[PDB]
């Protein structure tokens, strides 16, 4: 069955305005909170992942949302709390 | 609390008015912060809303996000529920943790009848979300011509 | 059609192909199906 | 050296200089009415 | 849809008017490509 879900909405005209690159917002909200895999590595003669996550205590609750930061072309710092509107929805965690 | 926000959210109409005699809390919350009013408004089950409000259920009551059940109404078409929430008492410039308001959602959609439902309930036009958007800036953005219109 | 005619040129003729068969075989002919674009020698707006 | 030039700027130029471009057609479908002219659009071919 | 296409923001000008998708295309639903006319007799016609 359906199960709340956590939507995230960016705002496009303030990330535009800020300086703030679509692509460093949606990088490092998925690389942070989904994590990513980044290359591979040779644990003991064997190949192996490499994943960049986020640390647990940073990406469990969404007050935890706001103390992300992406820089600006400027070379400013801005919190996802700045570009970033979030509500509660429901949908499948199935489909068929 | 737990058996009455699952009866709510399937919308069993014999069983929400059995566990209401059953001394079951209206303002159960779910993880989220979702009462059983909040479920009945977000699925659009008009009857148990008119239950609910009558045994005490919350009408102003928010999540975990600042979620009221009008803003779900009013998001999502339901009209005839924006009416009786707002019959009830729903605050109709409620503020969620972005500013957004139940005119604000409602004016995004496009629903014409419940802007004016909520208009005609005292909802503040010129009310701004987190980004200083009012209801207008929304339909001036989404090219809907209708509604530009009928917000002033 | 000749090299490098167009669309709209294929589309006159065939509508000209399909109103023969379609009046002067009325007895014979059910239907046609005109396709403009691509035929036996190759594909391009000159052939259908 | 001389030039203030790497292998780097080399093999972008034989990838901008050295390339396959698809243009499209003049009269190109869909097209407007009463196009007479349809025909291929040739930009950059491979060098040789 | 092509209102959601239509209101994607292009650019944000100084005075702050936002150029939107729309304000520089036209959107609408429609074919992948448009190089076959398929008629059948003459009326608009798709096929398997």
């Known amino acids: ?96 | 609390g737990k058996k009455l926000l699952e009866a709510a959210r399937a919308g069993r109409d014999d069983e929400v008015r059995i566990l209401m005699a059953n001394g079951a809390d209206v303002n159960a919350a779910d993880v989220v912060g979702w009462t059983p009013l909040h479920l009945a408004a977000y699925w659009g089950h008009l009857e148990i809303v008119e239950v609910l409000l009558k045994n005490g259920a919350d009408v102003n009551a928010y999540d975990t996000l600042g979620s009221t059940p009008l803003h779900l109404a009013a998001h999502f078409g339901h009209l005839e529920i924006v009416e009786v929430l707002l019959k009830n008492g729903a605050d109709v410039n409620a503020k969620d943790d972005n500013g957004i308001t139940p005119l604000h959602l409602a004016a995004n959609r496009g629903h014409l009848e419940i802007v004016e439902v909520l208009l005609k309930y005292g909802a503040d036009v010129n009310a701004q979300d987190k980004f200083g958007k009012t209801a207008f800036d929304i339909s001036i953005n989404n090219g809907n011509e209708d509604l530009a219109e009928i917000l002033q | 059609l000749p090299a490098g005619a167009t669309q709209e040129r294929t589309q006159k003729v065939l509508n000209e192909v399909t109103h023969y068969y379609l009046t002067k075989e009325k007895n014979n002919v059910e239907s046609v199906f005109a396709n403009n674009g691509f035929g036996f020698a190759g594909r391009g707006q000159n052939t259908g | ?48 | ?48």
């Open chain 4, 1 to 48: 050296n001389k030039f203030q030039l790497t292998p780097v700027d080399v093999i972008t130029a034989i990838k901008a200089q050295n390339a396959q471009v698809a243009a499209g057609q003049l009269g190109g479908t869909p097209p407007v009415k009463g196009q007479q002219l349809n025909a291929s659009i040739i930009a950059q071919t491979r060098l040789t």
């Open chain 1, 1 to 96: 069955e359906d199960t709340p879900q956590f939507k995230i909405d960016i705002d496009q005209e303030k990330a535009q305005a800020l300086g703030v690159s679509i692509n460093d917002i949606n990088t490092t909200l998925g690389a942070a909170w989904g994590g990513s895999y980044v290359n591979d590595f040779i644990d003991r003669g064997r190949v192996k992942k490499v994943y960049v996550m986020s640390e647990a205590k940073y990406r469990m609750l969404p007050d935890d949302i706001g103390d992300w930061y992406v820089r600006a072309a400027d070379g400013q710092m801005v919190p996802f709390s700045a570009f970033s509107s979030s509500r509660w929805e429901y949908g499948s965690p199935r489909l068929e």
């Open chain 5, 1 to 48: 849809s092509t209102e959601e296409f239509g209101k994607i923001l292009l650019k944000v000008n100084q005075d702050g008017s936002r150029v939107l998708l729309r304000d520089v295309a036209k959107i609408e639903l429609g074919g992948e490509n448009y190089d076959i006319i398929a008629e059948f007799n003459g009326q608009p016609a798709s096929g398997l």
